[PDB]
Design an enzyme around this catalytic site. Structure first.
Site, short mmCIF file in Angstrom:
data_model
loop_
_atom_site.label_atom_id
_atom_site.label_comp_id
_atom_site.label_asym_id
_atom_site.label_seq_id
_atom_site.Cartn_x
_atom_site.Cartn_y
_atom_site.Cartn_z
N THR A 193 0.83 -1.18 0.00
CA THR A 193 0.00 0.00 0.00
C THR A 193 0.89 1.25 0.00
O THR A 193 0.61 2.19 -0.74
CB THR A 193 -1.01 -0.06 1.16
OG1 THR A 193 -0.32 -0.08 2.41
CG2 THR A 193 -1.87 -1.30 1.13
N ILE A 229 5.78 -13.93 -1.54
CA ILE A 229 4.77 -15.00 -1.53
C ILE A 229 3.48 -14.41 -0.95
O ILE A 229 3.43 -14.16 0.25
CB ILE A 229 5.25 -16.23 -0.70
CG1 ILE A 229 6.73 -16.60 -0.91
CG2 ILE A 229 4.30 -17.41 -0.92
CD1 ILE A 229 6.99 -17.91 -1.63
N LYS A 252 -17.59 0.36 6.97
CA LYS A 252 -17.22 0.67 8.38
C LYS A 252 -17.89 1.97 8.84
O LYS A 252 -17.79 2.99 8.15
CB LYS A 252 -15.70 0.84 8.49
CG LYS A 252 -15.19 1.13 9.90
CD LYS A 252 -13.74 1.50 9.93
CE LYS A 252 -13.26 1.93 11.30
NZ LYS A 252 -11.92 2.55 11.21
N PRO A 304 -17.86 6.22 16.39
CA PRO A 304 -18.31 6.43 15.03
C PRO A 304 -17.71 7.71 14.43
O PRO A 304 -17.08 8.50 15.14
CB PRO A 304 -19.85 6.54 15.16
CG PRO A 304 -20.16 6.45 16.65
CD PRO A 304 -18.85 6.73 17.36
N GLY A 335 -3.12 3.20 10.03
CA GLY A 335 -2.11 2.74 9.07
C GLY A 335 -2.16 3.47 7.73
O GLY A 335 -1.17 4.10 7.32
N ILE A 336 -3.30 3.40 7.04
CA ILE A 336 -3.41 3.98 5.71
C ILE A 336 -3.58 5.50 5.79
O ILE A 336 -3.14 6.22 4.91
CB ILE A 336 -4.52 3.26 4.91
CG1 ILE A 336 -3.98 1.94 4.37
CG2 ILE A 336 -5.07 4.14 3.79
CD1 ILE A 336 -5.00 1.03 3.78
N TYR A 390 -15.19 19.46 6.51
CA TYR A 390 -14.28 18.60 7.28
C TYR A 390 -13.80 17.42 6.41
O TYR A 390 -12.60 17.10 6.39
CB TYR A 390 -14.99 18.10 8.54
CG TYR A 390 -14.12 17.38 9.55
CD1 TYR A 390 -13.31 18.07 10.44
CD2 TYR A 390 -14.13 16.00 9.62
CE1 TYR A 390 -12.52 17.39 11.37
CE2 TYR A 390 -13.34 15.31 10.53
CZ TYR A 390 -12.55 16.00 11.41
OH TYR A 390 -11.82 15.28 12.30
N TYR A 391 -14.73 16.78 5.69
CA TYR A 391 -14.43 15.59 4.88
C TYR A 391 -14.15 15.95 3.42
O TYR A 391 -13.69 15.09 2.65
CB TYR A 391 -15.56 14.56 4.98
CG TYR A 391 -15.64 13.88 6.32
CD1 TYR A 391 -14.53 13.27 6.88
CD2 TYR A 391 -16.83 13.84 7.02
CE1 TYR A 391 -14.59 12.63 8.11
CE2 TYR A 391 -16.91 13.21 8.26
CZ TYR A 391 -15.79 12.62 8.81
OH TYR A 391 -15.87 12.02 10.03
N1 LIG Z 1 -10.96 12.18 11.70
C1 LIG Z 1 -11.70 10.93 11.88
C2 LIG Z 1 -11.90 10.67 13.38
C3 LIG Z 1 -12.59 9.39 13.75
C4 LIG Z 1 -13.81 9.30 14.35
N2 LIG Z 1 -14.11 7.99 14.62
C5 LIG Z 1 -13.09 7.20 14.19
C6 LIG Z 1 -12.95 5.81 14.26
C7 LIG Z 1 -11.77 5.28 13.80
C8 LIG Z 1 -10.78 6.08 13.24
C9 LIG Z 1 -10.92 7.45 13.17
C10 LIG Z 1 -12.10 8.04 13.65
C11 LIG Z 1 -13.01 11.05 11.12
O1 LIG Z 1 -13.81 11.97 11.37
O2 LIG Z 1 -13.23 10.27 10.23
#
Ligand SMILES: N[C@@H](Cc1c[nH]c2ccccc12)C(=O)O
Ligand SMILES: [K+]
Length: 528
Positions: A14, A41, A78, A110, A360-361, A453-454
């Site tokens: 990755t 492998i 998830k 969450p 990780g990622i 934010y996203y």
């Molecule tokens: N910045 C992450 C914070 C987060 C909230 N819940 C999580 C659970 C697992 C890992 C990261 C998060 C987000 O808003 O997506």
């Protein structure tokens, strides 16, 4: 023309192929990109979890549609990490025990941002009620409709793919790697060299000029990216940059993992990653299509590989004599500097923590993002390198502090592992935040809507663990504010406003549990 002309990336997986694909796009065909990947492998897929920014920040930038890559990598959905048995003593079990107060020992972490009322997050209204006995609801169920959806194992989208909630992804990492390799080579003119590295050749100043392969071939370059994993063949061996071990904050250092076949039709599929507490660590569960990945993360100071392999087998009723296990020993910490001279570390070679909160990622993504923004010329401006280094270490230390908190504020003291965690010291900055929380104040208050934010990586990067995440974990483990935010005592209209928010969360959860397809059905629809 003092420009980098050639970038050589040591290592695939990755880290290597995300880097190659990302810089492929960022550098707009002005730079030759070579990946030198040892052929190995292909190990069993023990599952990786991710965070919501991945599609927008990475796949959308590369122009890869979500369904296209998900269909190739057996990806599932998830909506949280769900913590099981982190408060109660005992053997490892997939089934949650019961607290003294009668509640089940589960809590969710969450995604998304909490709504606010009179500029005060819902969390604080919940805490005011809980402290005064006006509610017996847990923080997660009261404040996130996603909790209800997860409890009924429903999907984050409808069957016509209308979005219901925020989500991220579970997948087999080697499949995503293979996919990105294929993308980068065919679509982006990245050169793939299938060989091992034997020499790292340097000039008088200690800058890397080339790598020799085991076949004798020399790969010349101007910038080198170390994606060699834990060995850190460039950054640690060749450049001699010291790795700062941080096992005095996090004790786990090993993992035993496998993939477990799963009757999805029969059991449903959980739209979440589970962290199942064990006697000497914890076990991940990452539902994928037809199987779940699982791995028992452990400290080998407190359990032998055999002990850990036995306890892990027992969780799922596996035959340890007839089961294929990947054993891993981890480096836990980060390099003193991620980038030295003309060698930039990304992935395991840069830094690592246990995947307790799916780091990780994200860590890979953050590095490549920051590398493109701090991309150098051949004069390697010291300030450019320094600012990059600064972002990785703040990123890392901040997540480190957050993970330690999970262990430090666990009430478990039933095994020497859990006892030993209560002997470790917290860094000043997480101490500061605990102090803030405990006065009833928000920590890392969101200043933005979810779209921003996203939609803008840099907004999330500057506020990654928000107030909501702190509440999820502290409150989840039983750590409460000393008292409510005092301002609330003066704000009856604001308290009334929050009651309406509480009702919106109940209504959304109830309506969406009623109308949403199962996670399982959404997968069938997607992968048909
Ligand atoms: N910045 C992450 C914070 C987060 C909230 N819940 C999580 C659970 C697992 C890992 C990261 C998060 C987000 O808003 O997506
Ligand atoms: K050169």
């Amino acid at each position: 023309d003092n420009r980098i002309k050639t970038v050589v990336i040591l290592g695939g997986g990755t880290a290597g192929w995300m880097t190659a694909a990302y810089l492929g796009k960022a550098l707009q065909n002005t730079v030759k990109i070579v990946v030198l990947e040892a052929p190995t492998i292909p190990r069993i897929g023990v599952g990786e979890a991710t965070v919501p920014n991945l599609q927008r920040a990475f796949f959308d930038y590369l122009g890869i549609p979500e369904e296209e890559w998900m269909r190739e990598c057996n990806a599932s959905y998830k909506m949280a990490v769900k913590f099981i048995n982190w408060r109660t003593p005992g053997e490892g079990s997939p089934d949650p025990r019961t607290l003294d107060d009668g509640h089940t020992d589960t809590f969710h972490h969450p995604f998304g941002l909490l709504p606010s009322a009179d500029q005060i997050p819902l969390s604080h209204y919940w805490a005011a009620k809980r402290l005064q006995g006006e509610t017996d609801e847990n923080f997660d169920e009261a404040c996130f409709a996603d909790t209800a959806i997860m409890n009924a194992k429903k999907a984050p989208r409808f069957l016509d793919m209308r979005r219901a909630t925020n989500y991220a992804w579970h997948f087999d990492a080697s499949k995503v790697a293979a996919f990105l390799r294929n993308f980068a080579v065919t679509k982006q003119a990245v050169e793939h060299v299938e060989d091992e590295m034997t020499e790292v050749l340097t000039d008088e100043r200690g800058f890397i000029t080339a790598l020799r392969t085991k076949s004798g071939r020399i790969l010349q370059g101007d910038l080198f990216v170390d994606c060699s994993g834990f060995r850190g063949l460039l950054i640690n061996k060749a450049m001699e940059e010291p790795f700062i071990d941080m096992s005095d904050h996090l004790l786990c250092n090993s993992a035993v993992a496998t993939a477990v076949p799963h009757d999805d039709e029969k059991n449903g599929v959980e739209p979440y990653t589970s962290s199942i507490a064990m006697e000497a660590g914890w076990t991940w569960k990452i539902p994928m299509l037809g199987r779940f990945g699982s791995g028992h993360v452990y400290s080998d100071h407190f359990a032998t590989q055999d002990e850990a392999t036995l306890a892990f087998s027992k969780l799922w009723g596996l035959d340890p004599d007839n089961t294929e296990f990947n054993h891993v020993r981890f480096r836990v910490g980060r390099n003193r500097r991620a980038w030295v001279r003309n060698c930039v570390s990304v992935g395991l070679a840069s830094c690592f923590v246990e995947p307790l909160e799916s780091s990780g990622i994200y860590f890979i993504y953050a590095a490549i993002h920051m590398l493109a923004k701090h991309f150098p010329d051949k004069t390697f401006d010291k300030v450019l390198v320094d600012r990059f280094n600064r972002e990785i270490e703040e990123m890392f230390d901040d997540t480190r502090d957050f993970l330690q908190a999970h262990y430090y504020f666990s009430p478990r003291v039933d095994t020497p592992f859990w006892r030993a965690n209560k002997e470790l010291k917290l860094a000043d900055s997480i101490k500061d935040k605990v102090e803030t929380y405990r006065a009833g104040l928000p920590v890392n208050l969101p200043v933005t809507d979810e779209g921003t934010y996203y939609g803008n990586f840099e907004a999330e990067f500057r506020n990654f663990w928000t107030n909501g995440s702190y509440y999820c974990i502290f409150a989840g483990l039983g750590l409460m504010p000393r008292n409510p935010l005092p301002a609330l005592a003066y704000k009856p209209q604001s308290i009334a406003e929050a009651e309406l928010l509480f009702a919106d969360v109940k209504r959304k959860g109830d309506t969406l549990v009623e109308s949403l397809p199962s996670t399982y059905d959404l997968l069938r629809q997607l992968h048909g």
